[PDB]
Amino acid sequence: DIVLNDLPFVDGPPAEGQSRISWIKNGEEILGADTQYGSEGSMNRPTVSVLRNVEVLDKNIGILKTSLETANSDIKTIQEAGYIPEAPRDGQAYVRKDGEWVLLSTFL
Amino acid sequence: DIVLNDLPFVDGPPAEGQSRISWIKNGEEILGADTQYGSEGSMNRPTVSVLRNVEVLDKNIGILKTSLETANSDIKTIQEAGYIPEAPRDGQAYVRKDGEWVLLSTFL
Amino acid sequence: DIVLNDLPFVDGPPAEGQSRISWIKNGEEILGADTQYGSEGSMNRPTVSVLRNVEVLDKNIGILKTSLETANSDIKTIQEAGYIPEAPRDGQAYVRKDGEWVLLSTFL
Protein backbone atom coordinates (compact mmCIF):
# COMPACT_ATOMS: atom_id res chain seq x y z
CA ASP A 1 0.00 0.00 0.00
CA ILE A 2 1.00 3.59 -0.69
CA VAL A 3 2.96 5.50 1.96
CA LEU A 4 2.35 9.26 2.05
CA ASN A 5 3.80 11.99 4.25
CA ASP A 6 1.68 13.33 7.12
CA LEU A 7 1.19 17.10 7.18
CA PRO A 8 3.79 18.64 9.52
CA PHE A 9 1.48 21.32 11.00
CA VAL A 10 -2.04 21.02 12.37
CA ASP A 11 -4.59 23.40 13.90
CA GLY A 12 -5.30 21.06 16.79
CA PRO A 13 -3.57 18.42 18.88
CA PRO A 14 -0.67 16.94 16.88
CA ALA A 15 0.03 13.27 16.16
CA GLU A 16 3.49 11.81 15.56
CA GLY A 17 5.67 13.91 13.27
CA GLN A 18 3.36 16.92 13.66
CA SER A 19 3.44 20.23 15.48
CA ARG A 20 0.57 22.49 16.44
CA ILE A 21 0.43 25.69 14.38
CA SER A 22 1.08 28.87 16.37
CA TRP A 23 -1.38 31.57 15.36
CA ILE A 24 -0.55 35.24 15.89
CA LYS A 25 -1.43 36.22 19.46
CA ASN A 26 -2.46 39.56 20.94
CA GLY A 27 0.38 40.87 23.11
CA GLU A 28 3.27 39.32 21.18
CA GLU A 29 5.62 41.56 19.20
CA ILE A 30 4.41 41.97 15.60
CA LEU A 31 7.47 41.41 13.39
CA GLY A 32 8.59 40.42 9.90
CA ALA A 33 11.88 39.23 8.41
CA ASP A 34 15.27 40.97 8.55
CA THR A 35 16.68 39.62 5.25
CA GLN A 36 15.35 39.69 1.69
CA TYR A 37 14.44 35.97 1.65
CA GLY A 38 14.05 35.10 5.35
CA SER A 39 10.66 34.01 6.67
CA GLU A 40 11.05 34.90 10.35
CA GLY A 41 8.71 37.10 12.37
CA SER A 42 5.29 36.60 13.91
CA MET A 43 3.50 38.17 10.91
CA ASN A 44 4.84 35.35 8.70
CA ARG A 45 4.72 32.51 11.20
CA PRO A 46 1.43 30.67 10.63
CA THR A 47 1.65 31.27 6.86
CA VAL A 48 5.08 29.60 6.81
CA SER A 49 3.59 26.56 8.53
CA VAL A 50 0.72 26.40 6.03
CA LEU A 51 3.31 26.54 3.23
CA ARG A 52 5.21 23.64 4.83
CA ASN A 53 1.97 21.70 4.55
CA VAL A 54 1.50 22.74 0.92
CA GLU A 55 5.00 21.50 0.05
CA VAL A 56 4.18 18.11 1.59
CA LEU A 57 0.87 17.90 -0.31
CA ASP A 58 2.79 18.57 -3.53
CA LYS A 59 5.14 15.69 -2.72
CA ASN A 60 2.23 13.38 -1.87
CA ILE A 61 0.54 14.18 -5.18
CA GLY A 62 3.84 13.20 -6.86
CA ILE A 63 3.86 9.85 -5.04
CA LEU A 64 0.33 9.15 -6.27
CA LYS A 65 1.27 10.24 -9.79
CA THR A 66 4.15 7.75 -9.96
CA SER A 67 1.96 4.90 -8.72
CA LEU A 68 -0.85 5.84 -11.14
CA GLU A 69 1.60 6.01 -14.08
CA THR A 70 2.68 2.45 -13.22
CA ALA A 71 -0.96 1.36 -13.02
CA ASN A 72 -1.63 2.95 -16.40
CA SER A 73 1.34 1.15 -17.96
CA ASP A 74 0.31 -2.17 -16.35
CA ILE A 75 -3.22 -1.74 -17.73
CA LYS A 76 -1.88 -0.98 -21.23
CA THR A 77 0.25 -4.15 -21.07
CA ILE A 78 -2.82 -6.23 -20.13
CA GLN A 79 -4.85 -4.60 -22.93
CA GLU A 80 -2.09 -5.54 -25.42
CA ALA A 81 -1.59 -9.08 -24.14
CA GLY A 82 -4.03 -10.67 -26.61
CA TYR A 83 -5.85 -12.65 -23.93
CA ILE A 84 -8.56 -14.88 -25.40
CA PRO A 85 -12.25 -14.39 -24.61
CA GLU A 86 -14.66 -17.18 -23.72
CA ALA A 87 -15.93 -19.65 -26.34
CA PRO A 88 -19.67 -20.13 -26.94
CA ARG A 89 -21.49 -21.95 -24.13
CA ASP A 90 -23.63 -24.24 -26.30
CA GLY A 91 -22.73 -27.80 -25.29
CA GLN A 92 -20.13 -28.04 -28.08
CA ALA A 93 -16.32 -28.26 -27.90
CA TYR A 94 -14.15 -25.54 -29.44
CA VAL A 95 -10.53 -25.27 -30.57
CA ARG A 96 -8.51 -22.14 -31.39
CA LYS A 97 -7.75 -21.18 -35.01
CA ASP A 98 -6.89 -17.85 -36.67
CA GLY A 99 -7.88 -15.84 -33.59
CA GLU A 100 -11.32 -17.44 -33.31
CA TRP A 101 -13.11 -20.35 -31.70
CA VAL A 102 -13.94 -23.13 -34.18
CA LEU A 103 -15.97 -26.28 -33.57
CA LEU A 104 -13.87 -29.35 -32.80
CA SER A 105 -16.45 -31.41 -34.73
CA THR A 106 -15.39 -29.82 -38.04
CA PHE A 107 -12.03 -31.64 -37.69
CA LEU A 108 -13.30 -35.09 -36.59
CA ASP B 1 -16.74 8.03 -10.43
CA ILE B 2 -14.73 9.51 -7.58
CA VAL B 3 -16.35 12.10 -5.32
CA LEU B 4 -13.99 14.68 -3.84
CA ASN B 5 -14.60 17.60 -1.49
CA ASP B 6 -14.74 21.12 -2.95
CA LEU B 7 -12.40 23.66 -1.36
CA PRO B 8 -14.34 25.62 1.29
CA PHE B 9 -12.70 29.01 0.58
CA VAL B 10 -12.09 30.79 -2.71
CA ASP B 11 -10.54 34.09 -3.79
CA GLY B 12 -13.46 34.94 -6.05
CA PRO B 13 -17.18 34.33 -6.33
CA PRO B 14 -18.08 31.15 -4.41
CA ALA B 15 -20.02 28.13 -5.68
CA GLU B 16 -22.11 25.83 -3.49
CA GLY B 17 -20.44 24.88 -0.22
CA GLN B 18 -17.88 27.68 -0.59
CA SER B 19 -17.26 31.06 0.98
CA ARG B 20 -15.23 33.96 -0.34
CA ILE B 21 -11.98 34.51 1.55
CA SER B 22 -11.81 37.77 3.49
CA TRP B 23 -8.42 39.40 3.03
CA ILE B 24 -7.09 41.86 5.60
CA LYS B 25 -8.49 45.32 4.88
CA ASN B 26 -7.10 48.77 5.59
CA GLY B 27 -9.17 50.40 8.34
CA GLU B 28 -10.15 47.23 10.20
CA GLU B 29 -8.68 46.54 13.64
CA ILE B 30 -5.46 44.50 13.37
CA LEU B 31 -5.78 41.70 15.94
CA GLY B 32 -4.54 38.23 16.86
CA ALA B 33 -5.81 35.50 19.18
CA ASP B 34 -6.54 35.76 22.91
CA THR B 35 -5.78 32.11 23.85
CA GLN B 36 -2.72 29.93 23.29
CA TYR B 37 -4.37 27.82 20.56
CA GLY B 38 -7.15 30.08 19.22
CA SER B 39 -7.02 31.29 15.63
CA GLU B 40 -9.16 34.43 15.89
CA GLY B 41 -8.13 37.92 14.83
CA SER B 42 -7.80 39.67 11.48
CA MET B 43 -4.04 38.95 11.27
CA ASN B 44 -4.81 35.20 11.20
CA ARG B 45 -8.04 35.28 9.22
CA PRO B 46 -7.13 34.61 5.58
CA THR B 47 -4.37 32.18 6.63
CA VAL B 48 -6.94 30.15 8.61
CA SER B 49 -9.09 29.92 5.49
CA VAL B 50 -6.14 28.78 3.38
CA LEU B 51 -5.43 26.11 6.02
CA ARG B 52 -9.06 24.94 5.83
CA ASN B 53 -8.41 24.41 2.12
CA VAL B 54 -5.17 22.54 2.82
CA GLU B 55 -6.98 20.17 5.20
CA VAL B 56 -9.54 19.39 2.49
CA LEU B 57 -6.79 18.79 -0.11
CA ASP B 58 -5.18 16.33 2.32
CA LYS B 59 -8.49 14.47 2.62
CA ASN B 60 -8.97 14.44 -1.16
CA ILE B 61 -5.49 12.99 -1.66
CA GLY B 62 -6.51 10.25 0.81
CA ILE B 63 -9.64 9.47 -1.22
CA LEU B 64 -7.52 9.11 -4.36
CA LYS B 65 -5.00 6.96 -2.48
CA THR B 66 -7.69 4.49 -1.38
CA SER B 67 -9.08 4.21 -4.92
CA LEU B 68 -5.58 3.79 -6.40
CA GLU B 69 -4.69 1.09 -3.84
CA THR B 70 -7.81 -0.81 -4.96
CA ALA B 71 -6.81 -0.35 -8.61
CA ASN B 72 -3.32 -1.64 -7.83
CA SER B 73 -4.73 -4.72 -6.08
CA ASP B 74 -7.20 -5.34 -8.95
CA ILE B 75 -4.33 -5.11 -11.46
CA LYS B 76 -2.21 -7.55 -9.43
CA THR B 77 -5.14 -10.01 -9.37
CA ILE B 78 -5.48 -9.78 -13.17
CA GLN B 79 -1.70 -10.24 -13.59
CA GLU B 80 -1.90 -13.41 -11.43
CA ALA B 81 -5.01 -14.83 -13.09
CA GLY B 82 -3.09 -16.96 -15.61
CA TYR B 83 -5.12 -15.75 -18.57
CA ILE B 84 -4.10 -17.48 -21.80
CA PRO B 85 -2.58 -15.58 -24.73
CA GLU B 86 -3.60 -16.02 -28.36
CA ALA B 87 -2.64 -19.13 -30.36
CA PRO B 88 -0.71 -18.85 -33.64
CA ARG B 89 -2.75 -17.44 -36.54
CA ASP B 90 -1.57 -19.87 -39.22
CA GLY B 91 -4.70 -21.61 -40.52
CA GLN B 92 -4.23 -24.51 -38.08
CA ALA B 93 -6.29 -25.55 -35.05
CA TYR B 94 -4.77 -25.57 -31.56
CA VAL B 95 -5.60 -27.22 -28.24
CA ARG B 96 -4.25 -26.41 -24.77
CA LYS B 97 -1.65 -28.66 -23.09
CA ASP B 98 0.94 -28.02 -20.35
CA GLY B 99 0.49 -24.24 -20.56
CA GLU B 100 1.06 -24.10 -24.32
CA TRP B 101 -0.81 -24.26 -27.60
CA VAL B 102 -0.34 -27.58 -29.41
CA LEU B 103 -1.55 -28.55 -32.87
CA LEU B 104 -4.82 -30.49 -32.87
CA SER B 105 -3.46 -32.48 -35.84
CA THR B 106 -0.85 -34.19 -33.63
CA PHE B 107 -3.74 -36.00 -31.85
CA LEU B 108 -5.82 -37.01 -34.91
CA ASP C 1 2.84 10.04 -18.57
CA ILE C 2 0.80 12.49 -16.52
CA VAL C 3 1.54 16.21 -16.82
CA LEU C 4 0.88 18.27 -13.68
CA ASN C 5 1.27 21.98 -12.98
CA ASP C 6 4.31 23.15 -11.01
CA LEU C 7 3.56 25.26 -7.93
CA PRO C 8 3.84 28.96 -8.89
CA PHE C 9 5.45 30.11 -5.61
CA VAL C 10 8.36 28.66 -3.68
CA ASP C 11 10.21 29.52 -0.46
CA GLY C 12 13.61 29.20 -2.11
CA PRO C 13 15.23 29.63 -5.50
CA PRO C 14 12.58 29.29 -8.22
CA ALA C 15 12.65 27.01 -11.26
CA GLU C 16 10.89 27.73 -14.55
CA GLY C 17 7.36 29.06 -14.14
CA GLN C 18 7.97 29.84 -10.46
CA SER C 19 8.53 32.94 -8.37
CA ARG C 20 10.09 33.24 -4.94
CA ILE C 21 7.57 34.07 -2.21
CA SER C 22 8.05 37.49 -0.62
CA TRP C 23 7.65 37.24 3.15
CA ILE C 24 6.68 40.29 5.19
CA LYS C 25 9.81 42.32 5.98
CA ASN C 26 10.63 44.62 8.88
CA GLY C 27 10.71 48.21 7.62
CA GLU C 28 8.14 47.85 4.84
CA GLU C 29 4.74 49.52 5.20
CA ILE C 30 2.22 47.17 6.83
CA LEU C 31 -0.94 47.38 4.70
CA GLY C 32 -4.12 45.53 3.74
CA ALA C 33 -6.61 45.86 0.88
CA ASP C 34 -8.61 48.95 -0.13
CA THR C 35 -11.66 47.14 -1.58
CA GLN C 36 -14.00 44.53 -0.12
CA TYR C 37 -12.59 41.66 -2.22
CA GLY C 38 -9.07 42.87 -3.13
CA SER C 39 -6.05 40.97 -1.86
CA GLU C 40 -3.41 43.71 -2.00
CA GLY C 41 -1.21 44.84 0.88
CA SER C 42 1.86 43.41 2.58
CA MET C 43 -0.22 41.77 5.35
CA ASN C 44 -1.93 39.58 2.72
CA ARG C 45 0.99 39.07 0.37
CA PRO C 46 2.61 35.75 1.30
CA THR C 47 -0.80 34.24 2.14
CA VAL C 48 -2.04 35.11 -1.37
CA SER C 49 0.95 33.28 -2.83
CA VAL C 50 0.29 30.22 -0.67
CA LEU C 51 -3.33 30.28 -1.89
CA ARG C 52 -2.12 30.40 -5.51
CA ASN C 53 -0.26 27.19 -4.72
CA VAL C 54 -3.34 25.63 -3.12
CA GLU C 55 -5.41 26.38 -6.24
CA VAL C 56 -2.81 24.61 -8.39
CA LEU C 57 -2.74 21.59 -6.04
CA ASP C 58 -6.53 21.38 -6.37
CA LYS C 59 -6.20 21.34 -10.16
CA ASN C 60 -3.46 18.69 -10.02
CA ILE C 61 -5.62 16.47 -7.83
CA GLY C 62 -8.33 16.83 -10.50
CA ILE C 63 -5.91 15.72 -13.23
CA LEU C 64 -5.04 12.62 -11.20
CA LYS C 65 -8.73 11.95 -10.52
CA THR C 66 -9.57 11.94 -14.24
CA SER C 67 -6.70 9.57 -15.03
CA LEU C 68 -7.63 7.27 -12.12
CA GLU C 69 -11.30 7.20 -13.20
CA THR C 70 -10.13 6.05 -16.65
CA ALA C 71 -7.91 3.40 -15.04
CA ASN C 72 -10.84 2.20 -12.94
CA SER C 73 -13.08 1.94 -16.01
CA ASP C 74 -10.33 0.13 -17.97
CA ILE C 75 -9.90 -2.34 -15.10
CA LYS C 76 -13.67 -2.97 -14.94
CA THR C 77 -13.69 -3.67 -18.69
CA ILE C 78 -10.86 -6.21 -18.30
CA GLN C 79 -12.66 -7.83 -15.34
CA GLU C 80 -15.80 -8.19 -17.51
CA ALA C 81 -14.01 -9.44 -20.61
CA GLY C 82 -14.46 -13.13 -19.78
CA TYR C 83 -10.81 -13.98 -20.40
CA ILE C 84 -10.13 -17.70 -20.00
CA PRO C 85 -7.82 -19.07 -17.29
CA GLU C 86 -5.16 -21.71 -17.85
CA ALA C 87 -6.05 -25.38 -18.42
CA PRO C 88 -4.62 -28.13 -16.19
CA ARG C 89 -0.91 -28.80 -16.71
CA ASP C 90 -1.06 -32.60 -16.63
CA GLY C 91 0.32 -33.78 -19.98
CA GLN C 92 -3.18 -33.95 -21.49
CA ALA C 93 -4.80 -31.83 -24.21
CA TYR C 94 -7.88 -29.71 -23.46
CA VAL C 95 -10.63 -28.09 -25.51
CA ARG C 96 -13.14 -25.43 -24.46
CA LYS C 97 -16.79 -26.32 -23.74
CA ASP C 98 -19.50 -24.63 -21.64
CA GLY C 99 -17.01 -22.29 -19.97
CA GLU C 100 -14.68 -25.10 -18.87
CA TRP C 101 -11.68 -27.08 -20.04
CA VAL C 102 -12.59 -30.61 -21.15
CA LEU C 103 -10.24 -33.41 -22.18
CA LEU C 104 -9.77 -33.74 -25.93
CA SER C 105 -9.57 -37.52 -25.44
CA THR C 106 -13.27 -37.69 -24.50
CA PHE C 107 -14.10 -36.74 -28.12
CA LEU C 108 -11.63 -39.03 -29.95
What is residue B13's DSSP assignment? S
Checking phi first, is residue C31 left (phi over 0); if not, alpha (psi -120 to 50) or beta? beta
Distance linking the first and last C-alpha atoms of chain C? 52
Domain at A1-108, CATH homologous superfamily:
6-Phosphogluconate Dehydrogenase, domain 3 (1.20.5.320)
Domains of chain A by residue range: 1-108
Q: How many CA atoms lie within 13 A of C15 on its CB side?
A: 3
Q: Taking Cα atoms as reference points, which of A3, B98, A51 lies closest to residue C57? A: A51
Q: Which amino acid, A65? A: K
Shortest Cα distance from C79 to chain B (angstroms)?
Answer: 8
Q: Is C24 within 8 Å of A33 (Cβ atoms)? A: yes
Resolution, given in Å to one decimal, reads 1.3
Shortest Cα distance from A2 to chain C (angstroms)?
Answer: 15
Radius of gyration of chain C (CA): 30
Q: How many CB pairs under 8 A join A and C?
A: 119
Is residue B23 helix, strand or coil? coil
- Distance, CA of B27 to CA of C3 (rounded, Å): 44
Parallel, antiparallel, or unpaired: how do β-strands C94-97 and C100-103 relate? Answer: antiparallel
- Distance, CA of A23 to CA of A11 (rounded, Å): 9
- Distance, CA of C103 to CA of C88 (rounded, Å): 10
Q: Is A63 within 8 Å of B62 (Cβ atoms)? A: no
Interface test with C, best of B3, B5, B19, B26 (most C CBs within 10 A): B26
What is residue C74's DSSP assignment? H
